[PDB]
């Protein structure tokens, strides 16, 4: 029964220009078990409207989903993907960055 | 759904015989021929999932799943290869549809033939007997009767391993009073060198 | 170039909570096209590209059917596998299955493979050959005989070879549009300081399929891959794919060093260096 | 499409 | 093996009857057909996975349970307007249609309208003619069991107490003595020929019997005969030495 910790990337699907409407990807990788909870949060605050692809995994057996939102930035807001997995004692929150 | 060319189809000792199917699902994967001797339970004897050839000695099937053509002949065709053959296709984890079927008989070699036409009384009785049509070639047809009280049965195969022979041997009876052996073959292209004692 | 067919399933035992989850799904390429979640409300397998639309409820019914069976298998093997290992009714277990085909530009068959594995250790593999089997437990090997006894090497070769690259290129003919088409990498470089001395160079690379590329960083020729860093090639949602290669300079010396592309989407290679 | 053959309980 | 059983039966509408079905090979796939003349094996029910089970076409009127992975129950319930046929019991290594099939070996149901036209069969063997054992190397012995119903016979002969087939046929098909309605009478017509050389001996036994499926133990009573219970009938012949 062994636990392969996730690899998250926070992403938009294009770069952004501010108040220009986009997609904000997170995408979550090489991890094991299947058990998983992926939120976006906007401001620190849970988006409700988070669709995500179908469970797969990689050669190695290690899955991979995107949970991909429809966003609208600007230079207030802050972003984030918070990933929960056995592998990690409290859910990882990665910020989003336009520069990464 | 699968549609089985159908006769029956007659063939010979040691001819070839052959029987298409064909089926509506390109969904199929798998493809089965079946045998099934009547009142009996259906047999296995030849399965194949890609497309060409699969052989075992004396079956070969064949495949064209673009086609959606499966195929079965036999060579050197016995009497054990008589009756019904059964085009079977899966695949779709669905079970399985068998085909209409066809009854493939298959002639011996009544090689030693001599038509007759004897009485048989019985064992507790004097008259109320039967008519035994005897040791005739494959190509006869006994056909149906002629009274509603006259039974007249068809034919039957007969082999021994002692003697290696195979007889032909219809049988035929009736209630009926005036009732002869002569006349109990009034329906029927009988041989006209057959032996009446 | 090459093409394939692939289908991925899932099967996760949650006990006290109930029957196992099961999620089936089937990519052409790097392109999803069929889905089964058992947790869905439809309970049947849905199409995830316009292409596969095409195909009448007869196709849909089929592969419906043909994937509750598969959820059925891996129901009972986690029964078995549990068994096999005498672990506790307690836990939860995984088990993934994957098969395949494989076709060249050409289009003709070249490999076909059905991966198996129980909590994400290899357990079951058919072979190359698409004969032999290969099993790291002897736990697997009581599978193993089980799967040779029962010929599944037969029926599973001539699915691989046959069924699935004539289906493979009936797909490859309908959303060809959608999947024999080539999008090209739209590259650049964030360059941004890590100190007074130092600054970093991420080549980037966005808006490409399919997600096959390879970006390596050269200082003027020399194959630099130390001080590099390469993340893993995001799904853009898009359809399209994108990636970065990172690496630290000596800055100031800035512009002296090369990012090399390599990609089908462009005909021939590229090279940049800061603007 | 899928396999419906070469599909077995472990 | 698989193993279907019985081999016939037959229950009067207002009761139930159940074809069990049971196999050692440990595989997932069980399935049940009903073959009509005519037709080929339609599916009543296949069951992929224990504790589950699938619709064919022809499954209104049937049960089946999937308590065990070894057995496969098909419950013939007070169905259809139309149960009589034969019924086939099989397993498969596999996905349901993936694999080769093992069959059970068959059974026989039927309905009955009332058991008052239930009879057994009266048997009765003609000896061979002597104009035959002349040209032959042989002789002919014919037997007709006649007047039974419902069809379910077998039919060995026994040279001494020897079941015996070389020699033997039977006939697939029987013959009925009414050509109209459902309810009528049967009759079979088996040949056993044999040489010249162990017949004509007097001092050896000739017989043909029939395994006959009629009525149960449980079964009721208001006539003025015997009943028909599952048991054997039979006729008899000797050599006549020349
Ligand atoms: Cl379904
Ligand atoms: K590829
Ligand atoms: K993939």
């Given at each position: 029964m062994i636990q392969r910790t996730p690899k998250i990337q926070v992403y938009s699907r294009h770069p952004a220009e501010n108040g220009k409407s986009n997609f904000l990807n997170c995408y979550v990788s090489?991890?094991?078990?299947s058990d998983i909870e992926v939120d976006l949060l906007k401001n620190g605050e849970r988006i409700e409207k988070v669709e995500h692809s179908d469970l797969s995994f990689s050669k190695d057996w290690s899955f991979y989903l995107l949970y991909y939102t429809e966003f609208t930035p600007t230079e207030k807001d802050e972003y984030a993907c918070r990933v929960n997995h056995v592998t990690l004692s409290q859910p990882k929150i990665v910020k989003w960055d336009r520069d990464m | 759904e699968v549609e089985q060319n159908s006769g029956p189809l007659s063939v010979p000792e040691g001819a070839i015989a052959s029987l298409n199917c064909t089926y509506?699902?390109?969904?199929?994967?798998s493809f089965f021929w079946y045998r099934q001797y009547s009142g009996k339970s259906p047999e296995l004897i030849m399965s194949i999932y890609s497309n060409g050839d699969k052989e075992d000695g004396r079956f070969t099937a064949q495949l064209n799943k673009a086609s959606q053509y499966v195929s079965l002949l036999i060579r050197?065709?016995?009497?054990?290869?008589?009756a019904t053959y059964l085009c079977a296709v899966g695949g779709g984890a669905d079970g399985l549809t068998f085909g209409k079927g066809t009854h493939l008989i298959i002639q011996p070699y009544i090689q030693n033939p001599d038509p007759a036409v004897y009485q048989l009384r019985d064992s507790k009785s004097s008259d109320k007997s039967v008519c035994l049509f005897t040791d005739?070639?494959?190509?006869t047809n006994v056909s149906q009767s002629k009274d509603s009280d006259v039974y007249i049965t068809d034919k039957c195969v007969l082999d021994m391993r002692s003697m290696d022979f195979k007889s032909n041997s219809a049988v035929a009876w009736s209630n009926?009073?005036?009732?002869?052996?002569?006349?109990?073959?009034?329906?029927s292209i009988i041989p006209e060198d057959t032996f009446f004692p | 170039g090459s093409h394939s067919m692939r289908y991925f399933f899932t099967s996760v035992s949650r006990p006290g909570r109930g029957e196992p989850r099961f999620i089936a799904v089937g990519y052409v390429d790097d392109t999803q096209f069929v889905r089964f979640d058992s947790?869905?409300?439809?309970?049947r397998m849905e199409?995830?590209?316009?292409?596969?639309?095409?195909?009448?409820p007869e196709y849909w019914d089929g592969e419906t059917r043909k994937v509750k069976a598969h959820s059925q298998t891996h129901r009972v093997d986690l029964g078995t596998l549990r068994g096999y290992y005498n672990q506790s009714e307690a836990g939860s277990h995984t088990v993934q299955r994957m098969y395949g085909c494989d076709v060249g530009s050409d289009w003709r068959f070249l490999r076909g493979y059905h991966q198996y594995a129980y909590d994400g250790k290899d357990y079951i593999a058919l072979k190359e050959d698409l004969r032999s089997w290969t099993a790291a437990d002897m736990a697997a090997q009581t599978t193993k005989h089980k799967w040779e006894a029962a010929h599944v090497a037969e029926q599973l070769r001539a699915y691989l070879e046959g069924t699935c690259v004539e289906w493979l290129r009936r797909y490859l003919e309908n959303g060809k549009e959608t999947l024999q088409r080539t999008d090209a990498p739209k590259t650049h470089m964030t360059h941004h300081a890590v100190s007074d001395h130092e600054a970093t160079l991420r080549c980037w690379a966005l808006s490409?399929?399919?997600a096959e590329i390879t970006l390596t960083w050269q200082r003027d020729g020399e194959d630099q891959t130390q001080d590099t860093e390469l993340v893993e090639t995001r799904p853009a949602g898009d359809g399209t794919f994108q990636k970065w290669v990172a690496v630290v300079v000596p800055?100031?010396?800035?512009?002296?060093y090369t990012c090399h592309v390599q990609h089908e989407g462009l005909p021939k290679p590229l090279t940049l260096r800061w603007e | 499409e899928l396999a419906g053959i070469g599909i077995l309980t472990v | 093996g698989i193993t279907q059983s019985p081999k016939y039966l037959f229950r009067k509408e207002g009761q139930n009857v159940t074809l069990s079905c049971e196999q050692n090979?440990?595989?997932?796939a069980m399935y049940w057909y009903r073959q009509d003349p005519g037709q080929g094996l339609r599916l009543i029910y296949y069951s992929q996975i224990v504790n589950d089970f699938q619709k064919g076409?022809?499954?209104?009127g049937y049960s089946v349970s999937r308590?065990?992975?070894?057995s496969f129950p098909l419950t013939v319930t007070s169905?259809?307007?139309?149960?009589?046929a034969f019924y086939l019991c099989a397993s498969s290594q596999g996905?349901?249609?993936?694999?080769?099939?093992?069959?059970?070996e068959g059974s026989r149901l039927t309905v009955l309208?009332?058991?008052?036209?239930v009879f057994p069969p009266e048997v009765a063997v003609f000896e061979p003619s002597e104009a035959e054992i002349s040209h032959t190397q042989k002789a002919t012995l014919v037997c007709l069991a006649t007047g039974?119903?419902?069809d379910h016979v077998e039919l060995s002969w026994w040279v001494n107490g020897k079941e015996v087939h070389s020699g033997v046929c039977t006939d697939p098909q029987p013959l009925k003595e009414?050509?109209?309605?459902?309810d009528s009478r049967y009759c079979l017509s088996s040949r056993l020929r044999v040489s010249a050389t162990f017949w004509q001996n007097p001092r050896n036994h000739f017989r043909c019997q029939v395994q006959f499926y009629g009525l149960s133990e449980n079964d009721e009573w208001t006539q003025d005969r015997a009943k028909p219970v599952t048991q054997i009938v039979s006729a008899e012949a000797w050599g006549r030495a020349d």
């Open positions: 090489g991890f094991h078990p | 509506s699902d390109r969904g199929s994967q050197d065709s016995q009497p054990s290869d008589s005739f070639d494959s190509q009926k009073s005036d009732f002869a052996c002569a006349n109990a073959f009034n329906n | 947790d869905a409300a439809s309970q199409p995830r590209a316009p292409w596969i639309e095409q195909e009448g490409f399929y399919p800055s100031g010396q800035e512009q002296r | - | 090979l440990n595989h997932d076409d022809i499954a209104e308590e065990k992975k070894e169905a259809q307007k139309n149960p009589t996905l349901a249609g993936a694999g080769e099939l093992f069959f059970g309208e009332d058991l008052k036209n039974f119903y419902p009414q050509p109209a309605l459902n």
